[PDB]
Each structure stands twice: as C-alpha cells, then as structure tokens.
Symmetry: C2
Subunit: 412 residues, 2 copies
Amino acid sequence: SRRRVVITGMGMLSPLGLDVPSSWEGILAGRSGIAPIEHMDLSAYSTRFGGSVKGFNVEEYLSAKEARKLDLFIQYGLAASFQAVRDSGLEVTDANRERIGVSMGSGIGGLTNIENNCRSLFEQGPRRISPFFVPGSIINMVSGFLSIHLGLQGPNYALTTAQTTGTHSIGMAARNIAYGEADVMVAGGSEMAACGLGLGGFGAARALSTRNDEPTRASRPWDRDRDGFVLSDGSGALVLEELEHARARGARIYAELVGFGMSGDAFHMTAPPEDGAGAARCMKNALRDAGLDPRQVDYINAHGTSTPAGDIAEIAAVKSVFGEHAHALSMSSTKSMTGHLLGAAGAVEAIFSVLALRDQVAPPTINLDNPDEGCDLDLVAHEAKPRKIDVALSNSFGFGGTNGTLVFRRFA
Amino acid sequence: SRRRVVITGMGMLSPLGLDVPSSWEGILAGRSGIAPIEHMDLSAYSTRFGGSVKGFNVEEYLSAKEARKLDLFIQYGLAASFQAVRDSGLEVTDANRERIGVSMGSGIGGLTNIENNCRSLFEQGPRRISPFFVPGSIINMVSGFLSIHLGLQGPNYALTTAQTTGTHSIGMAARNIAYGEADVMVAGGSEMAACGLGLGGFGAARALSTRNDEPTRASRPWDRDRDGFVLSDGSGALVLEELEHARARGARIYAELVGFGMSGDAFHMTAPPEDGAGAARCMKNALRDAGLDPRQVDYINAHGTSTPAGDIAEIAAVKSVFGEHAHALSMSSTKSMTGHLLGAAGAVEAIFSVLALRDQVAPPTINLDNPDEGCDLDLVAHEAKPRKIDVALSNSFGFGGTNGTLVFRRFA
Ligand SMILES: CNC[C@H]1COc2ccccc2O1
C-alpha cells in the first residue's frame, strides 16, 4: 500500500509579501505585486516591470558573510524553507534526522550571479571570478545549504522542470514519504531571473507582456487583451509529513496531499497543444492517483500564465477532464496578482491551494475584464469567492511540455 | 507492489568515444581522454586541459536548423538518449507512449550558451539575445526535446544535484518504474561546462588539477600526488524498463537495477567529511534497498574525483561499510581516464558498471603510481582486472553533501 502525506508547515517570499499570511492577505484582497523593476536600467528592454520581492532582509536567516556567497534565488529558497520548518514545529533529533530530506528546486537558477561573474570575466579575466561562484549559483544548493544548516540527512535533491519545478518538487517529495524513503521532506522552489538575461531571454522570445504603462494590468489570464506572462521572483516551501508522524508529535495539519500527476505533451518546446491534451492526461493521472472522481474537485489553481495559447489550452483541458462538472468547480490564476514565479510558481500556488481549503475561498483572477472566446467557466473574475472546497487542484505546465498536477483534500 | 527494473539500452558521449563500445574499449585499455582544450584560448586560466568530446557530429541525430538553437549539453544528452533508445529495440506507439518517460539531468546546464548571450547583452544590448536563449539553455530541455522527437508522454523531468545528478536521475527513474508510474524511462545526464565560467569558477575555488604539462596524468585518484579533479564533457543515457514488459517484448537485458540509495552528509557546501559518513549511509541504504549482504559486492565504480579529501573519504566509507570484505572487492575510478563529467559522471559510470558485469572485468584506475596513506584496497591500479562480478555498485557525491549509490547485478 501507501502512507498518507499531510502539510504541517509553509514558507514563502512573493511580490505580495515576505511570508505566507501577508501574501495570502494580498491574494484575497486582489492586490497586484507587479511594478517597474528598480535599481536596474531597462531603457533598452521591451518589458520594464514584474513581481519583485520588496524589502527582503536575508540577515533574518543568514549572517551577511554566508548570504554574500549565495545567489538571490538560493537566499529566497532558504528563507521559505526556514519559514516552513519553523511553521511546522518539527524538532530535528539524532533519532529522526536520517528520515528528513529536502527537494527544493529552480527553473533557471543563478542568472544574477552568472551575469555579475561574466562582468568580471569579460572586463578583468578569469582570476576575478568568485571562489563561491559554482556552489553559490547551482540549483541543488537550497537543498544543500538547508540540509547542512538543520542537520537533515534524508533524501537531498533538486528538480529543474522550468515553470513546473515547484509542482514536481512537492509531488515527488510526497512520493518519497508515501513509499517510506522519508517521514518528512521540505519541498518547493525559488526563482530570481529578473536580471538582464531573464527579461532579455524571455523578451527575445516575445513571451512577456510589454504593457509598461499599466504594470498592474499586464497579467490578465483568459482576458482577450493578454499579451504574454509577467516575470516574478520568490519562493515557496511546504513541510511534507507522514500522517502518523504528524499526529504523534501533535502537529497542526493544514491539509492532506492525496494526488500527484505528471505527464509530457511531446508537442512543442514552449507552446502547449491547443486542446490541452497533456494537461488533461496529467490532471486525469492526478485524480486517479488520489482515487477521486473528477466531480469531487471544487477549486483549481490554474497555471493561468496570461499567454494567448496557455490560458485557452487550460480551459480545453478542464472542459475535457471535468465534462458537466467544469462549470460547477471554481478555477483562478493567482498569477493575475503575483505574476509568474517560474520554478517557484507551483510552490506558492500549492500554498494558495492549501489556504483556499483552510479559508473556504477561491482566490480571484483579477484583470479578467473581458473573457476571451470559450473562457465561459467560473474563473472567479475580479474578487475572491467564498464557497465549499473539499478537494483543490494545483496545475503547472512548463517548457518541454512538462506537466504537473497536485491534489489537496481537507484533513479532519 | 514494487516491480523489478532492468537495463535494455545504453548510450554515451565521453572523452574516449562517440558511443558506448568505443568509450568501453578505451576504459579496458587504460587510455586517457584528457588533452589541452582547443575550442577556446585558456592562457589566462590556471587549468587549460580537460576531457572534450572529440569529433561530435550532431548531424547524426539532429537537423543543423534545430542543433543551432541548443546548448552542446542538450546536444550531448539527445545523442546519448537517441543511442540508448535505438540500442533498446523499443518501439514507441499509441499503446505505450503514456508509459515511457524521460529523466535526463545536468549539473550546470547551458553555461556556454548563457556566457555567449551574456557577452551579446553586455557588448551589444538586450535585442541581441537569441529568442532560443531560454529553451536552448535550461536543464529540463533534454527531457523536453527527447519527448517531442520520440513522442514520450510518460513522466517528464530533470534533476540538478551537481556531481550526483547522473546517479540520482537513473535511481529515481527506476523508482518511477518500480512504483508503477512508468514501464520505461530514459534516464542519465549530460554536461558541457568547459567554457570560461566553468574552468574559471572551478579555477577560482582551486578544485581543478593544474597539471597543464602532463594532462593525461592529472586525474590520479588515490595517488599521493593528486591536486584536484579534471573537468570533462559528455552524456550517458540508459533505457530502464519493468522486467515483465522487457520479457514480454524479447528485450536483451544487460543487467538488473536492484538497489538505489540517497543520503545527505549535512556536513559542508563542497567538502566531504574525511570519515565518508554520508557516503557510508548512502551505500548502506542502497544494499538494504537491494536486500544484499555487503560481501556480495565484487566491484565498486568509485566517484574517485582525484581530490585529496574526496578520495580518502571514499576509502573510509568503503572500509566502514564493507569491513574485512573491503579487501576482497575491486574498486576503480574511470575518472582516472574520462575525468569528471560532473552531472554526467553518474550516467557514464552506471554504464561502465553494467559493462563490468557483462564482460566480467574491473576497469583500471590509471596513474595510481603511489597510493596515498590508507589507500590499501584493490583499486585495480594501471590495468583492467578480469574477475567474477555478480554485484556492481556505482557511487557519486556532490556539492550540498548529496550522495547517490546504484546497485546492479547479472540477470539470467
Ligand atoms: C528550526 N526552525 C527555525 C528555522 C527557521 O528560522 C531560522 C532562521 C535562521 C536560521 C535557521 C532557522 O531555522
């Protein structure tokens, strides 16, 4: 059989807040974390805005000397990781440290550090490159640094599945636990790609909204006026825990992780198939994994990136999977407020999906002023919607056509 | 319940050849793939050699029009994946495409690509960034591009765990099959970090051999005169397959994958503990995973990087895990010849471990002229050793204290 897996801790940095309760407050209020990027000259760029983390103090987590060694994406991951473990009340002992592992990932990793060490390399040559460049930039260093700080000796790994990283990190962490390889895992993702190379990289593929005049209105999933996604920074971390382990130590359980679906589109490098056939298979796989009928699903945290083709594919995939229940369920994109945290997107959207269970409210899809053709579902336009939510889905569809779905259920 | 997993296909680019057999003949003949580097000018660098892939012809695999858009690491990953799938005899169909996934990883990913696009950003501005920069550079696109070309709609992901990437990738792809999430996975990794930032970054940390006047003698695992690892490029992919599915289609089976271990050292960001404590935990998890008596292990393919601390820690780990039987088994580092393919190390070395079982020979550790204090095991100095091998183990250890062990045995 299979052990059940519960959420006992959550941590986050978002464009909405420096922790979960502040971010969730922004979500339910419909606030935007999008704004022109500061302390960066973007004159020559077609996009000049996104979701920055505002006022982050790494010295709440790290000495200034240890933070200097580490790319912002790693700092963000450690901050969410540290928040999550503390949120869980968990006490690490010699008796259980071998049973606690980490799977924190990144889409893109250390661009900002890579850009700054390039400056030195090109200007002054190879000897001005930092000694800490490699371990300070590689994606498995949130997992590494976290495991070293807390004495975690369980499964230590990192995923990098572009915009699906957060969803895949959590899902596969839940497997580790379910199949008895670990009793506890810290899982999710972090991202800081708002450098030249990120805005330029995504800018060159014309993947980004270029609505520089109204940055708060740029991210407008399923609206007829959307012109691409909004690039955002942050981290999410959940503490995943075997149910009996959680009950024994008297843990507060937010919710149960019942289902994880993966699939591949095998279609295109950056664009989904128009009918969302891959997101449909992935959701069906997640619901089968959870032993649930599609009818039982109440709330979907959509990928909902605000790209023409991505938004429309997700409607086709929901209508396909859910048939006559697809109007009954509520589906929103919190990217309408946060923008697209890429590899952290699924970590923070898992947390929003768990909080929708706790608080019995669908987050809004803000900026959905004029739904596009066939976007006739309950997309929770403009304002939060209190309702019954027993089961909640979080979807992530990324480059390479890599799909992930998480199923959360109320736990009592 | 838990299914058995066998190797039906393998593929490789190494510094010793453009496939498996050509690389293997070099391994058995104690040939070095290490040479001064020619694809760029390294006079400002403290280390000017490595294991390059020689005469790689991407137009054996890909149209030049697609090849141009992709980092060499992805080209290398696809070349090894394509070989492995062809070598498997597997035929992809509507009936089985949902059950065939891919997990091809990398340590650092498209560093060359990110460097070149950085140069363009700094010298010429953001409008000279390739539209292919992102999908052409991010680590999950070996998994992405493979799935698209072959139509693999199974689990689609990528691991980034530094120098452990290949072992973890192979090990967790086996767990996918073991637990029924897939019947087939293509798993391994690819690295091409031989650019300014690579040799520069590893140079800045003083990790690399600087034996520039004798590059073939630089990588000398467990030799008293070792002075850092040698940086090498390439790819390894295997087709992992449920046993009954392999039997059902008359698949040739190289060997069985009976054991996977992970652990975290939780010691240091880049230094292994001198006692090999995390390594020992990892190998013990793997042998317990395979239900084996440690005395059944005949051959260990060591991580064996040719760093002072790494090499001694491995001896300590092996002595501690294997006690007196540590003196009966054969251990070698093929890094003595290939150098360190970082994220791809685990993938090529897993294939060497399988060929050690097929051909009943321990590959040599070349350059082991003066074994260091305490390095008194059978490390197969200088020359291949024909011997009985039923059980073969492949170890990797990475930055972040991340450990991986794979256990293989003959299948009849
Ligand atoms: C063990 N629970 C506390 C976590 C979160 O707060 C931390 C902050 C800094 C360093 C370690 C930390 O550990």
